[PDB]
């Protein structure tokens, strides 16, 4: 089958209550050197020119498929919006949505 649609990454699920972040993230192996960037943006909606990245990490490799599977968990003290980067050291992409932002269900 196909996985890739979206994106080479696709976000799995994150979970909040509280002040709590806890993501993970569902992105194709394209070389060996990646690196999972979160964007998610503050409970100020969407970013002021800014850039609030957090680092996800890896749990290991999808197995029935050719992916790779992420994660992560965050104290985030306010958050409204996001999307998820896929930065690698070849090449970059994102995961959102449409074209705008992921509406974080607070």
Known sequence: ASIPSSASVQLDSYNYDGSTFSGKIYVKNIAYSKKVTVVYADGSDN?????????????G??????????????????????????????????????SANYQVST
């Open 47 to 59: 970013w002021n020119n800014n850039g609030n990245i957090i680092a996800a990490s890896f749990s």
């Open 61 to 98: 490799p999808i197995s029935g498929s050719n992916y790779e599977y992420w994660t992560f968990s965050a104290s985030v003290k306010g958050i409204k919006e996001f999307y998820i980067k896929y930065e690698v050291s070849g090449k970059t992409y994102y995961d959102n949505n449409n």
